[PDB]
Amino acid sequence: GPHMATGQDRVVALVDMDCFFVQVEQRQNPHLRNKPCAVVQYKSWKGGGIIAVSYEARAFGVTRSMWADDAKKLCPDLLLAQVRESRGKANLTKYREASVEVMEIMSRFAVIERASIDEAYVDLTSAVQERLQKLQGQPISADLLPSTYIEGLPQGPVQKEGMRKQGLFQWLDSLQIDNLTSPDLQLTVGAVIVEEMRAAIERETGFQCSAGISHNKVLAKLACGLNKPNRQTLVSHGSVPQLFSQMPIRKIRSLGGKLGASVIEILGIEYMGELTQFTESQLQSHFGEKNGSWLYAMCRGIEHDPVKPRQLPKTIGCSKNFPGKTALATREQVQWWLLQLAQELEERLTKDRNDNDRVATQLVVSIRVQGDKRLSSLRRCCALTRYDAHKMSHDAFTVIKNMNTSGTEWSPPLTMLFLCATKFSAS
DNA sequence: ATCATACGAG
DNA sequence: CTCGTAAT
Ligand SMILES: Nc1nc2c(ncn2[C@H]2C[C@H](O)[C@@H](COP(=O)(O)NP(=O)(O)OP(=O)(O)O)O2)c(=O)[nH]1
Ligand SMILES: [Mg+2]
Ligand SMILES: [Mg+2]
């Protein structure tokens, strides 16, 4: 009881932009606002692949990884914004710059770990303690949480907003505002700060976002998706047993692939909560020492992964696929594309160095050969001593000359090219 | 025929 | 080091 850790030591939030790429295009082109719309890359093949979908468009069934032509069938009036193309490939610069706008605002409030182009984890433990000291023992008004949902409430003895208020009222009524060490109280204050954060992001960028507040990253991330869009959700330690009782295992971060599938099949279970019935050693025996320990604690709502203080991406890369009959087959083609990638990379690296006082020191070159099922067929690295596209492209070629078979021909033909800058050091 | 863009195991 | 897995 007393010596049992409950994983209520920190206050962690996850802020994720709503239909991010769409909002970026909607801010730029007002004609797209408040309409069914999506972001697509590469129109020629089947209308292009959809990578972002507005909530209005989702109502029609449009989704990610869908061909625009097919989406148009579900939603005839679907509006489409195209990803920029430069040097023969998709260019995501607009989205990276928009992401920076958001990350910089969040970093004002606390240490953040950039988890993706549109979301970041926030460690609000220190901020809440400071906020708690201020306005000590004074009741927290519901007005301070206009967009917050308390998971699992209301409970006990017909409109969604009405439902939200009810739950919120039960939560606040129950709170013990006098004990500054109360974990629930701490989450509540964290929620207040996140309201502030989200208001700042929308006021200063025009972008709306959702957020999750909890004691760790997995629960915060999970909480965030519960009430999107434009809403934030508080998931307390106490709400975990009921929340996890019907939560499919694949919903938890890092359990959506093979590992999650193995848990389900080896253990013969479907929901996260069903994991509590196994001993740590049992879980370790099936999924390894690290995975077993993590599952044992996670199914109980406990996780110790820290919010890493990293606002910038660790790598800068450029990659292009060349499907089916379009696979690269000549020396001239390979070199041309390597140069295109090398040029985009060079501009991206030069800007990075000027903005972030760092320089990449290693260049990674990856390819795929036709007939290979894997994402990558081969990976090779070389020094990156100069930010020059011509040198990097030539170095890259040198590095992959070995795969080619004789004949100016290239074979087997290449289905993918990838250049990635890595191993940054201060500059 | 989606594509383009961190981390642990060995 | 390269590779496989994973999320967005
Ligand atoms: N190329 C590509 N880009 C993607 C993919 N998935 C996501 N993105 C890009 C495009 C996305 O807009 C952005 C954010 O990823 P989310 O947060 O997963 N989705 P969103 O923010 O759109 O909606 P909401 O969060 O409200 O559900 O990342 C993909 O599979 N491929
Ligand atoms: Mg998002
Ligand atoms: Mg996201």
Q: What is the CA radius of gyration of chain A?
A: 24
- Name the 3-class secondary structure at A115: strand
* Cβ neighbours for A184, distance < 8 A, ≥ 6 positions apart: A175, A176, A236, A237, A238
What's the token pair of residue A313? 């991406």
Complete domains list, chain A, with CATH: 1-18+89-248 (3.30.70.270), 19-88 (3.40.1170.60), 249-306 (1.10.150.20), 307-427 (3.30.1490.100)
List the A136 CA – C6 C1' distance (angstroms).
Answer: 43
* Cβ neighbours for A360, distance < 8 A, ≥ 6 positions apart: A316, A349, A352, A384, A421, A422, A423, A424
Closest CA to A209 of A186, A192, A225: A225
| Choice from A51, A222, A228, A319 to test ligand 1 binding pocket (greatest atom count within 8 A of CB) | A51
List the A382 CA – B10 C1' distance (angstroms).
Answer: 22
Sign of the Cα pseudo-torsion (A413, A417, A423, A425, in order): positive
H helix or E strand, kind and range, residue A359? strand A358-369
Q: Residues for chain A: how many in total?
A: 427
Nucleotide with C1' nearest the A422 CA: B6
CA distances from A49 to A157, A298, A327, A401, A409 (A): 49, 35, 19, 32, 31
- Cα separation, A22 vs A76, whole angstroms: 18
What is the whole-number distance in angstroms between the Cα of residue A17 and the centre of ligand 3? 6
* CB distance A380 to A400 below 8 Å: yes
* CB distance A23 to A57 below 8 Å: no
DSSP assigned state of A248:
B
* Cβ neighbours for A269, distance < 8 A, ≥ 6 positions apart: A249, A263, A275
- Name the 3-class secondary structure at A118: coil
What is the whole-number distance in angstroms between the Cα of residue A136 and the centre of ligand 3? 35
CA distances from A86 to A46, A91, A97, A117 (A): 20, 6, 16, 20
Deposited experimental method: X-ray
- Cα separation, A113 vs A264, whole angstroms: 30
| Choice from A15, A17, A319 to test ligand 1 binding pocket (greatest atom count within 8 A of CB) | A17
* CB distance A420 to A413 below 8 Å: no
- Cα separation, A368 vs A397, whole angstroms: 14
Closest CA to A20 of A37, A3, A45, A2: A37
List the A92 CA – B5 C1' distance (angstroms).
Answer: 9
What's the token pair of residue A61? 């069934």
**Resolution reading in Å:** 1.9
Q: How far does CA A60 lie from the centroid of its chain?
A: 24
- Cα separation, A330 vs A401, whole angstroms: 12
- Strand C nucleotides with an atom less than 7 Å from a protein beta carbon: 1-8
Closest CA to A386 of A349, A357, A417, A355: A349
- Cα separation, A72 vs A38, whole angstroms: 10
Residue whose tokens read 């995501």: A92
CB contact burial A242-263 (16+ within 10 A = b; e otherwise): ebbeebebeebbebeeebbeeb
Taking CA atoms only, the protein residue closest to ligand 1 atom 22 is A19
- Cα separation, A387 vs A133, whole angstroms: 50
- For residue A82, is it left (φ>0), alpha (ψ between -120 and 50) or beta? beta
- Name the 3-class secondary structure at A301: coil
Q: Is A118 annotated as a binding residue?
A: yes
What is the whole-number distance in angstroms between the Cα of residue A14 and the centre of ligand 3? 10
Q: In what order do the strands lie in the sheet with A148-150?
A: A112-116, A119-123, A12-17, A209-214, A232-234, A148-150
- How, if at all, do strands A112-116 and A119-123 pair? antiparallel
- Cα separation, A378 vs A130, whole angstroms: 51
List the Cα angle A269/A223/A125 in 5-degree steps: 120
Residue with CA nearest to C3's C1' atom: A379
Rounded to the nearest 10°, the torsion over CA A160, A165, A168, A170 is -110
* CB distance A38 to A78 below 8 Å: yes
- Cα separation, A52 vs A65, whole angstroms: 9
Instruction: Identify residue A422 by its one-letter amino acid code.
Output: T
Residue whose tokens read 């208020």: A165
Considering every ligand atom shown, identify the ligand nearest to the alpha carbon of residue A20 and give its number: 1
* Cβ neighbours for A261, distance < 8 A, ≥ 6 positions apart: A250
What's the token pair of residue A384? 């990156």
Considering every ligand atom shown, identify the ligand nearest to the alpha carbon of residue A23 and give its number: 1
Q: Is A104 annotated as a binding residue?
A: no
- Cα separation, A186 vs A425, whole angstroms: 38
Residue whose tokens read 């696979």: A327
Sign of the Cα pseudo-torsion (A197, A202, A203, A204, in order): positive
What's the token pair of residue A381? 């690295």
List the A189 CA – C6 C1' distance (angstroms).
Answer: 33
- Cα separation, A427 vs A424, whole angstroms: 9
* Cβ neighbours for A15, distance < 8 A, ≥ 6 positions apart: A106, A119, A120, A122, A194, A197, A198, A201, A209, A210, A211, A224
Sign of the Cα pseudo-torsion (A183, A184, A189, A190, in order): positive
- How, if at all, do strands A89-90 and A85-86 pair? antiparallel
- How, if at all, do strands A79-82 and A37-41 pair? parallel
- Cα separation, A68 vs A50, whole angstroms: 6
Q: In this structure, how many other beta carbons lie within 10 angstroms of the beta carbon of residue A176?
A: 9
